[PDB]
From a paper:
Eukaryotic DNA replication begins with the loading of the [name] replicative DNA helicase as a head-to-head double hexamer at origins of DNA replication. Here we characterize human double hexamer (hDH) loading using biochemical reconstitution and cryo-electron microscopy with purified proteins. Although both yeast and humans use the ORC, CDC6 and CDT1 to load an [name] double hexamer around double stranded DNA, our work shows that there are clear differences in how the two organisms accomplish this feat.
We solved a 3.1 Å resolution cryo-EM structure of the hDH. Forty-five base pairs of DNA could be clearly resolved inside the two [name] rings, although the length of the central channel is compatible with protection of 75 bp of DNA, as shown by DNA footprinting. The pre-sensor 1 (PS1) pore loops, which emanate from the ATPase modules, are arranged in a staircase configuration that follows the DNA double helix. PS1 pore loops of [name], [name] and [name] engage in minor groove contacts with residues that will form the translocation strand upon replisome activation and the h2i pore loops more loosely follow a staircase pattern and engage both strands. The zinc fingers of the N-terminal B domain form a 13 Å passage that is too narrow to accommodate B-form DNA where the two [name] rings dimerize. For the two DNA strands to traverse this tight pore, 5 bp of the double helix becomes underwound and one base pair is broken. The resulting orphan bases are each stabilized symmetrically by R195 and L209 in [name]. The neighbouring base is also stabilized by R195 through a cation–π interaction. Our structure of the reconstituted hDH matches that of hDH isolated from cells, although four out of the six catalytic sites were bound with ATP or a mixture of ATP and ADP in the structure of hDH purified from cells. The double hexamer structure and the degree of DNA untwisting inside the central channel had the same appearance irrespective of whether ORC6 was included or omitted in the loading reaction.
Author numbering:
A (entry chain 5): 393 to 654, 667 to 734
B (entry chain 4): 433 to 670, 683 to 783
C (entry chain 7): 241 to 305, 337 to 361, 376 to 420, 427 to 490, 508 to 548, 556 to 642
D (entry chain 6): 207 to 308, 321 to 661, 717 to 792
E (entry chain 3): 269, 281 to 518, 542 to 656
F (entry chain 5): 246 to 294
Write the structure that this text describes.
Amino acid sequence: FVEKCSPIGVYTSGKGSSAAGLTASVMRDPSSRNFIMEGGAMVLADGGVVCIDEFDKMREDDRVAIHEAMEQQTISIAKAGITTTLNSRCSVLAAANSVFGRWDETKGEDNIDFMPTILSRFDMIFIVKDEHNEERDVMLAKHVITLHVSALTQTQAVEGEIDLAKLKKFIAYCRVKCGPRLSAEAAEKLKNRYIIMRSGARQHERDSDRRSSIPITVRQLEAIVRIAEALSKMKLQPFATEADVEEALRLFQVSTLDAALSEDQEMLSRIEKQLKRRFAIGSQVSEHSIIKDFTKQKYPEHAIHKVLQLMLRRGEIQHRMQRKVLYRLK
Amino acid sequence: DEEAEQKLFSEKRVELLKELSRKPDIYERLASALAPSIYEHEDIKKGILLQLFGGTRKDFSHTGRGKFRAEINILLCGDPGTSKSQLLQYVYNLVPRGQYTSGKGSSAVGLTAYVMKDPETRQLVLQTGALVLSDNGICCIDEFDKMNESTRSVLHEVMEQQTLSIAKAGIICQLNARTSVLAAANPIESQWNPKKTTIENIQLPHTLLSRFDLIFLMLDPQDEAYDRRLAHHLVALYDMAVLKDYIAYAHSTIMPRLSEEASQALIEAYVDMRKIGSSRGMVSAYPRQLESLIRLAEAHAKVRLSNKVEAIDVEEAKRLHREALKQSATDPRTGIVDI
Amino acid sequence: SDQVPVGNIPRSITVLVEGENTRIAQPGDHVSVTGIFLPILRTGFRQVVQGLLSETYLEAHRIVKAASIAPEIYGHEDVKKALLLLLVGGNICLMGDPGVAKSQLLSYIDRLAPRSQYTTGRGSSGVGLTAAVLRLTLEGGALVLADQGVCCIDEFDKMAEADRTAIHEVMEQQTISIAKAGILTTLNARCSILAAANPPAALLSRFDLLWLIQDRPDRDNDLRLAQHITYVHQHSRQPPMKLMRRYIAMCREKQPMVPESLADYITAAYVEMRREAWASKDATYTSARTLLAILRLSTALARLRMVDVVEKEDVNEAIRLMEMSKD
Amino acid sequence: RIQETQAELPRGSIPRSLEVILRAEAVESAQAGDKCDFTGTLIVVPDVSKLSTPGARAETNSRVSGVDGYETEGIRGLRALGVRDLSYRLVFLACCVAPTNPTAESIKNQMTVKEWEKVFEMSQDKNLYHNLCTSLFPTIHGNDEVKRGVLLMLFGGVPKTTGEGTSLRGDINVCIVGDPSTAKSQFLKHVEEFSPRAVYTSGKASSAAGLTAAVVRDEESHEFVIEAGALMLADNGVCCIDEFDKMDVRDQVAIHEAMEQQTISITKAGVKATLNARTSILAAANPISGHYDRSKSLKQNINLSAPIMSRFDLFFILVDECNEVTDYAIARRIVDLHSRIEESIDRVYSLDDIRRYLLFARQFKPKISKESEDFIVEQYKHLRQRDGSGVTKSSWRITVRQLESMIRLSEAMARMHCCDEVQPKHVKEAFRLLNKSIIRVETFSEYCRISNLIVLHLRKVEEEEDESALKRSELVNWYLKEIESEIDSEEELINKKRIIEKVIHRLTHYDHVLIELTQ
Amino acid sequence: SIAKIKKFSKTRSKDIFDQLAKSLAPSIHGHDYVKKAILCLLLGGVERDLENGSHIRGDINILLIGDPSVAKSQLLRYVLCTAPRAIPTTGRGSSGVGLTAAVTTDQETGERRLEAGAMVLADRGVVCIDEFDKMSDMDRTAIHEVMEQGRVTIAKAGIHARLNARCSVLAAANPVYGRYDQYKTPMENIGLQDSLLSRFDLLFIMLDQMDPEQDREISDHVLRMHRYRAPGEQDGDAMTQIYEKHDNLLHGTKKKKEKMVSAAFMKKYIHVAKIIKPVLTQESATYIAEEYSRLRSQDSMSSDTARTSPVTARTLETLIRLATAHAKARMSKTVDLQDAEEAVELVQYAYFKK
Amino acid sequence: QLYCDRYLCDKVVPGNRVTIMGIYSIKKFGLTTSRGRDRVGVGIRSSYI
Ligand SMILES: Nc1ncnc2c1ncn2[C@@H]1O[C@H](COP(=O)(O)OP(=O)(O)O)[C@@H](O)[C@H]1O
Ligand SMILES: Nc1ncnc2c1ncn2[C@@H]1O[C@H](COP(=O)(O)OP(=O)(O)O)[C@@H](O)[C@H]1O
Ligand SMILES: Nc1ncnc2c1ncn2[C@@H]1O[C@H](COP(=O)(O)OP(=O)(O)O)[C@@H](O)[C@H]1O
Ligand SMILES: [Mg+2]
Ligand SMILES: [Mg+2]
Ligand SMILES: [Mg+2]
């Protein structure tokens, strides 16, 4: 949808596409001596949006080049008798899969394979999980079937949708027309919040005694700045207000801080640590006994159920002939 | 060319050589006369002489087996601080139709034959390589370890079938490569480490090793008499025609043949060799060693100017085969050479 | 390379040579040529610009082609003596820690020798060594050019295996053999090799002399080295070649000989040396090659003295040099 | 184009190539790959670009000189005097072409009465199966299975086509893997000598264009001509490949394409063409380690791709015994070859007679009888049942490809014996050979059987009841109670009890197959 | 593609390099040592030749290692913009052949021709290498020839040449563990051999310490730069004096007591200083030699801290080179003791870490 | 093959999907003799739009 909506947009996966690379290359024609350059997926877009599936499969050369492409928006290529610098002013929108194939909440870190260097360049990081909600599945199924039924007759799902052509032209118009900048009063509040967030991150790192895989740097501060500026630009205003910065900080918290801080998870870790000691290898325990023991400790039952489900997925816990009593394997 | 014509008018020389052959020590004398400026290694020189004489070129086309290799291939494995290179140089300079290759310097296409086009005329489809130019001659290979598997693939067929098959675009042919190989090799560590076994020291596939008739494991005993003799000889460094005529006459005038006594001696030698080489750690034996024994016996029969191979020749061949590999001093159940 | 401007590439010219001037110059030589600059009228493929164009060429009429070794470098006196002996003649390898000037000694050796070549590594690898066919004539590499001279190789351990095998063949057999598609030749290379490297049995077994340069941080030696370097950088001259070339040329004219009696003495020494090597189980190599190297060094020293008969002092100095190198 | 044969080569010389020209009726004969005698003339034909340097040339005898303004300079003078360069080349014109050594009715008519008598005498001998084995391979000792397989491959099966447009293979492919010096290349050389149309190639010597085909331009006309490769010259013959592992993987891909489609497709130099390659492949390969590992399956001992591995009809494995009496029996033969150059051979049929009989035999296309259908069905059923878990692992695993191979081998046997239909004897022989080719892995059976029985009992207990289960002592007691009718004395009973207890301990602790829980 | 300079130099002396280091790049916050080192590259040493044809290197080389977002690439880009002959060549962007040179057979004539690489084109210039750690080993072995002697030897049968490649190198490499580990010694983090480290004149390590006041300063600077708009451009729109005019945002109210040097005058002064040829004095030679001996003895005394780079003979040449660069900074005729002291301070800071 | 004159040049980039209105014609460079080793075709003029 982003590829279709933006005036300029390229959709690619890792390793490029069918017959087009992800980064540009340079060759020399032997017959007639001309320096030919082949357009890559990044060079072909200027001011557009590049959607990238399968972020994990990239090759080494492209992985190294994308660092400069994301940071300085330029690529530098030198060969015998030639040195060139190409422009690539692209926004990046990437999707990736879990390391183990599905997310493991209790493991926390190590669910992401990317080194912190590449993760630093991103502005916002979203984490999505298949969350168990019995009554939400009914609504999702009904929504899907309603969409399938209504696709045949009327493309009028919502009363006030902007038409795709109108939305495209309006986005282009706003992008070309004006450009906003921050305000000092909002700037000071942003500074204070950023200092507080950095202090909290350092405190979390020192208390947990582990290096954070998703750090908070100056680039994230500039990311919040850029998001606020974009929100201001959406209204054609030359200067932003406090509300824009507040919304930007809310979004930044919801995405990045929830990604980096990944009491519920710590409490689940406590339950796992307790169970590992309590569970006797080569012995059986009734689920009712565990439920009673942990509810007398006043821990929620849903956490215990989720921990048991995760152990079942890992394979340490197995059911007997009757599901009332479980036993421990390795 | 000259051997295939009756140019032995020198009846005086014929009588002199035929009288010399009846003397007992002439064998050793030949081993002495093969190289005056080379050291006490008489076994190596005897092996080279037997290589020079060569086995009988029998005809087996009626059998359908194909060509039978009648020549001798020898290997010398040792540290670089020895005189194997000088031996290869002397053999190259002594025998006509000689070629010399060294390590990675040659390629697979460099040997056999390669496709060309004339710089003066339109075409010259194929041009011979190092091995074919060595047909009916001697090829000396040095630094045999560094050669890649691609060239060893060629050597596998060359060393046994005596023929080469080439099949490329518009070029399908079979060529004759009836050469004799003198190969030199080094230990993997450039030292003969006594803790490792012989096979581990050499590090060559058994298929390639089995085709060598004789293998000489050069070792340093550090004997005082050896040091004194070699020092005196080297510091003191500061009839060829008769040998030539004798070698040509023997090589061109006698066809060795063997009786049942030699047959049974060869069979006994074969079963004894199989018994000895069964134990792991040492180089195992294969049926081609029997043919190697036959070839050495025929060469020794040629040395004595005899058309009949006697049990003496077979016993001498067995002695050389045993001594070359140093199987007597080697520990049969650990594969470690001792002194 | 001195006259090339900044960032450009050397230009080439073509010379034609007449009867007696023929057979004077060889590839790789530095020459001075007295010539006439004349054009050649060219008729051939059509061109953009009308008129009479031509190609230029030069018609020649005449072509013209112990002591201190590298006094700028402080220390290494014994290594300098060994270098002198190698230059005079009858293969030396240096292994050293980084920061010790091994490359500059090889550069000095290249500049001093009449016929010399200097290689730096993979830049001259492959076809830069051995020889290749070009439009047909066969053109040689650095080893071929340095025939009957001295060759210098830097960063020896970083070379490809094929180059090292070729170098070993040159050192031991003194000829190169090439058998590839289009080339089937044996090349004559009667040159002695000096090699430099960073920290194997191959070097000990194949080479004659190895010099290990270890940087032990002694205060006095380091302070003297610092003083020497400051002197060099400030006064542009060491603290207080043509003659050396003439002396070497005069020296190489003679050929001493070994008498019969001294053999016994030499023999005794050799035996005793080996016995000591057999006593010290930590020792690595002794063989007749060491005796040959000692004889060659003694003959070189006798040649330096211009004596017809080898003497005792030369043998003692060769023994001392080998002992110093081994230690 | 013709080439000088190998037997005429002098020392270190490449064979000479010559051009032959056929006119009118003689044009038909002399196909590519033949070995023929020519009778004709040797004739001189002019050439153009031979002389890069001036040579002999012609001119006119008239004493003519130029005139001012028309002086006989270079070009005009040469054109006026009619100067031509005398360049020539040697060309052979053929008037008679014959084979060097010489549609079933046509073959029968070609043979004379004595040749037909010999063929009929050969036809009705059972020893034809035996004597052909010894005739083609007199010197090689043992390995009669390989000889029988090679003969069956030589005779071959019958190709067929279906109504849907598909085609079915009629050829047989054979592979030999063995330890060093087990006469592995001798079979290849003997088949190369015997067959009239056979090509022997090593793995690395032959290039991709050396096989398949090449396309070049005609000298005179605008058309194109095709240079045949090894597979095309061996069409409807045998191709021998030694050192099969050394071939490039892409060359192996091309070989597999030729084995499956039996067609070579060329799209080059403006020419699109399809050519038939109905070859039978005999290949020799070495083990990965240089020796066969008895403890591993065939797929783990050879570096060959799965498709080409499945395409081969028969695999033969040779292993050298260390110190058996055969070492004597081998030696007696080898010296017999050296002591007796030619008198140590007792061939029954000459090679020419065998070639004639093979040519006659390959024409037959026997059908499949009705009883043979059920016999083959039941034999394939038994073969597949052999793969059951009651016996040790085998090197192969049996699929429908084995059934098709059995049918092909039955057709080959019928062709060899010249019978008009496939009969149960041939089916039995093919079944025997295919079973003997299969080798069982040697490392144990009793331990596996006991473990399987215990697993069966425990899982039956688990599945049959939602109630409580048994313990280790209960399992031991149950197994002993079941054995009760099989052990006659207390000593055997206690020994088996100790053995089963140790086995159960190993299963629970070492193998982790069975789980143990506390009270 | 005179009075002002003389007056400014003669009046300022030390303040010349002081302000030049301070006013190197307002867009980058802090890191005085790296600015000093970059200025030393810009000024450079002195090339020297002797009677025997011996060549002595005069170029400087630097390697920076730091945590992400410490603005190493910004520094590289600024050096690219300011330096006259600057070429950027990242790790895997250019291989060993495209770095130095190559030989090609001309099909038109059959002769052999030489094609220059990146380092040969940058004669007496600057090559910037971003992501230096990703470069392969063979490329670094090739760069050895340029870094040691400044020449490239090329040979293929039919032609051989020695091309000039005198050059200076900037390099930035990430730590092996993604982020620099404090407890482990720098040798484990860098993961480079001693020879390559000795090839470089300077090593620097940069860290992102999360001090609340330092973070406040960084945020202030970044947002001041962000809010700034070019004069003469209307708000909301889309898209020579020696000392720069004071700016309310780019400089600040407190900085009114000092000023920054204009870019154009800075370039002119840099060129003039690069022209000037200073000479070493007798006062400082013994002083530098004694301090080199002191460092090589302190090798045993430095027990509380580890060493980033080994101390070899190249360190003394580096000392002299940095002294001459500082003497170039302030236009004069001879090298004095203060330049030696500054060089030694730089060496002490770079060569050891806590 | 298409012929473009004057202002029609550079209006189309390779890879575009275009609809073109034109005149179907043949080249006219005199009555030249056929070339090459193939001379089967008689009276064939190369066509274009
Ligand atoms: N003994 C010495 N005397 C004078 N200068 C030295 C000495 N040892 C080293 N140097 C200096 O140190 C540098 C060593 O660099 P280089 O010789 O290239 O090292 P390597 O040869 O080990 O690569 C040289 O530039 C040289 O000026
Ligand atoms: N069973 C056998 N009978 C007769 N000769 C044999 C036998 N096995 C081996 N040989 C002899 O040993 C040699 C084996 O070499 P070869 O068959 O080329 O080995 P491979 O084919 O494994 O490379 C042949 O020359 C053959 O004469
Ligand atoms: N000291 C500093 N002063 C100003 N901005 C900085 C500083 N350090 C980091 N930044 C900001 O952080 C970003 C770092 O990006 P980059 O230079 O690519 O980091 P790296 O080169 O370490 O990957 C820059 O956009 C820069 O604006
Ligand atoms: Mg060096
Ligand atoms: Mg074989
Ligand atoms: Mg960066």
